[PDB]
Design a protein around this ligand. Structure first.
Ligand code: BYN
Ligand code: BYN
Ligand code: K
Ligand code: K
Ligand code: K
Ligand code: K
Ligand code: MN
Ligand code: MN
Lengths: 498, 498
């Protein structure tokens, strides 16, 4: 099935009429990423580049925009639904519920199998050169060829008890090394730290590209510390994932992985990394810093391997649909587990996924007999002191009438119900997300503060209940009149799903 | 011409295929406003209700949505352009420049003429009853029938030197009185205060509905204190406006006015006013307060008179397209007159026109050799201490790459370049706009504070110049590649003005 095998996922997009196969030569230097960028900016069909200039020995085709949006509102999130065995018309609420469902289920550990398609071909250290592969230059100011935008890094705690799967960027350094971001509080960083403190050896590592779509979704989600993503994906899908051992280490990769790199993440060495055109929409040309360094010892890959690629930047791509939404999902749960009356959470695209709107059950709120200042502080302490709140700099609290999955409605509530200053609490002593330009390239500390809880609950939502109705068609007119108007609409001369 | 005669304006909308004539009976109790509301929420054609239940003796037809948006992007602002003799494809920049053009021209005073269409019919105090006219109930919780949503109040200073034209709401109180909002710092209020201090007499008053479209635009704009709107409109249009004297007082009304009320605004009496479904999208049911009281002594009107109506509330109507944009225009000029390097200003619809984005000439800014904290304070002091800043609670400063007329781009810059708290200055000792729910129905003083300058200039925009490029199709790819991609787009299989 498509959720369990990337090759099947590509076939699913084709059958959905959601994929454009480009069989003429396309340059991995900027052209593939430019086409992908335009797809993302216009919600077009995913591009599959079958004829990439410089592809050799089967490495590699590219699929762009794997988790981006479709044009129609009815199946807007269909490419995400296809990661998860959900109907293509699934709502965001349904997708995030699916992604949270495993959080109160027993893990289903993976099953080891002796081989799989990822072993169809191999290149040893004397046979590959990463500078000879058709690795894309994604943005013209990028500081490297970013091979790794949609693969899963696999690292394991020294004691073997936790195996983490996560997305973090990496670019080619030389024939057999990458550099990339490994930053706190991310799990790749947490595990790296464990190995560094042990001080014995570099971290055994693999990077698998074109993994089971359900696994790349979990890779992008801040599920709890110490939780092995493979078991969470197993529980979510109701099926044990099939993994095969790496040839040169004892880590396990999805059997149907398109391309696998095997090697080490150094506990001592660094190398130049970045800049990269990032999720918030910018590239700071020449802004290169030392990053984590990976050595590649072996490549294995499927016949006619396909590399997924995120051509990320301005709206809308994987960095918005997956980073933002999956963090919002985890934050929703975290708030509920802390006894806060939050029903729903979403990161508005309009905020460049730097905000999360939290829908409040105001019946529950009223029973708490609290105030804005107290509630704001409590919510911000829970979220901004936790890893799930890392990427989010503004929380907007809204009452039950707002659909947080609708950015227009979030912006309306924020703009009209939250008095600047008075209805907000600033948080300066929390971890900040340095990738946001106003953090890393701003006026203050790159790694601390810059966060805010903005309360768009109105005063009576804490006491006696909402005391307005909207000045809109829906609420300011009785049902019988509304229906008459709709029934006579085209008749009168005015204009009128899938 | 359409800009100088409301009847001609209606004819222009017809010819533009921007008007739906409804000749079957429509109820002024909610139905007309519900149809209008749906038009505004969907950017449909303006409705002209030719058969209003309860219309008698020629009073009256209704035109809804006179200044609302069209569906197509190419002529989005066409209904505003038709107020001003501009091409229907005019940009917002062009419309606001037209509205500011008279600010450095000599006034063209109006011309008195002996009669006009507004004198075709008359009703004396023994012949009309305002509770018998088909005055609309616009929202179901409104505290009155709001006769006055798109007419022009006309009041004159005691000394005769300043005649003000402005829009302020009013509803029917009884057979020969209205109540309405007359609040500081508005000119109707400033003039009222002059009469109250003189203490001799009630204020001579007229309310003209269906006035020259260019005059209703100025009526909605905060042009300076002491400036007679008629002379400003004269200069803007290059033509002296033709006015006729009222029958029962010595004020002058546009000759082609559809309906004119003549009477007095009391210096001593008040009456119940509101609630009303307001520009920010709400109605607070039962929230009635004492408002200003007007006595009507005489009605004059055109044959087959048409009453314009704003069915205001959630996006998008006259309260957004005219209040927000015309305040932004005046703020742009005010900033320039105070030697601030502002090129453009607009009130984003997404902010419910509570924000104004100010585009900065950053070459000029760099020459000032200043800082964020200093610049923010200076801009906020200029704007928030002036009447033109009354309705605006957040100013967003953006550099030259942002098109402030594009809300998506304003939201991007705000979300990514302004660090909450650190990059903002709050203003608590300025006049606030009580109509905003978080003001009048909020946690703090209804009439003071709640304002903020949010600086979305990046640090190097003050020093050496922008130091990024966008991670977008436009900026992250060379021109020749971009053009190749566009040229091969439909060929490859992807999707493609008026
Ligand atoms: C979907 C997606 C997620 C991420 C990234 C990308 C995509 C497409 C890049 C295009 C590669 C851009 C890059 O900036 N990137 C990225 C990243 N997290 C990082 O620490 N470093 C990164 O370079 N995340 C987010 C992480 O995947 C999530 O924060 C996840 O929660 C981490 O897993 P874990 O540590 O919780 O196990
Ligand atoms: C276009 C438009 C403008 C306004 C209004 C409406 C429309 C459609 C209502 C639908 C009637 C809603 C109402 O809230 N309303 C309104 C109002 N100003 C008020 O003091 N009171 C009001 O009740 N303005 C704004 C004013 O027209 C401008 O602020 C103008 O600048 C005033 O003129 P002046 O005092 O500068 O001469
Ligand atoms: K993860
Ligand atoms: K609030
Ligand atoms: K005015
Ligand atoms: K800033
Ligand atoms: Mn993890
Ligand atoms: Mn005025």
């Amino acid at each position: 099935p498509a959720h369990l095998c990337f090759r099947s996922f590509v076939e699913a997009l084709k059958v959905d009429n959601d994929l454009v196969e480009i069989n003429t030569p396309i340059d991995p230097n900027l052209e593939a990423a430019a086409i992908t960028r335009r797809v993302c900016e216009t919600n077009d069909k995913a591009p599959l580049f079958n004829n990439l200039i410089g592809m050799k020995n089967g490495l590699f085709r590219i699929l762009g925009a794997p988790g981006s949006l479709r044009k129609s509102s009815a199946d807007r999130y269909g490419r995400l639904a296809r990661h998860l065995a959900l109907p293509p018309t699934a709502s965001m609420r349904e997708i995030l519920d699916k992604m949270l469902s495993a959080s109160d289920m027993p893990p289903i550990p993976p099953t080891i199998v002796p081989t799989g398609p990822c072993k169809e071909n191999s290149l040893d250290d004397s046979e590959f050169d990463l500078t000879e592969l058709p690795v894309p230059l994604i943005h013209k100011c990028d500081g490297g060829k970013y091979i790794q935008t949609y693969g899963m890094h696999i690292v394991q705690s020294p004691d073997g008890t936790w195996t983490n799967w996560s997305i973090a960027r990496a670019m080619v350094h030389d024939k057999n090394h990458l550099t990339g971001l490994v930053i706190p509080p991310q799990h790749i960083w947490q595990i790296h730290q464990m190995w560094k403190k042990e001080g014995r050896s570099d971290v055994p590592w693999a990077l698998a590209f074109g993994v089971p779509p359900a696994a790349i979704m979990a890779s992008s989600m801040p599920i709890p510390d110490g939780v092995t993503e493979a078991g969470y994906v197993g529980a979510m899908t109701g099926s044990s994932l099939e993994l095969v051992k790496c040839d040169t280490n004892d880590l396990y990769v999805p059997a149907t992985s398109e391309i696998v790199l095997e090697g080490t993440l150094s506990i001592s060495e660094t190398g130049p990394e970045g800049p990269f055109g990032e999720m918030h929409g910018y590239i700071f040309c020449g802004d290169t810093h030392l990053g984590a360094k990976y050595k590649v010892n072996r490549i294995t890959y499927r016949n006619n391997a396909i590399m997924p690629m995120s051509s990320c930047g301005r709206l809308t791509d994987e960095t918005h649909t997956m980073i933002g939404s999956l963090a919002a999902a985890e934050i929703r749960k975290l708030c509920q587990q802390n006894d806060l009356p939050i029903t729903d959470a979403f990161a508005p695209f309009e905020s460049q996924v730097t905000w999360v709107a939290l829908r409040v059950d105001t019946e529950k709120l009223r029973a708490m007999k609290t105030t804005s200042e107290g509630f704001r502080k409590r919510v911000g302490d829970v979220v901004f002191n936790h890893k799930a709140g890392y990427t989010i700099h503004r929380l907007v609290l809204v009452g039950d009438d707002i659909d947080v999955y609708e950015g227009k409605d979030v912006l309306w509530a924020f703009s009209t119900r939250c008095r600047p200053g008075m209805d907000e609490t600033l948080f300066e002593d929390v971890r900040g997300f340095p990738l946001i330009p106003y953090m890393g390239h701003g006026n203050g500390p790159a790694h601390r503060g810059g966060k805010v809880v903005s309360d768009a609950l109105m005063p009576t939502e804490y006491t006696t209940g909402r005391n307005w109705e909207a000045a809109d068609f829906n609420q300011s007119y009785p049902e019988d009149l509304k229906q008459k108007v709709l029934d006579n609409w085209t008749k009168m001369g005015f204009s009128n799903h899938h």
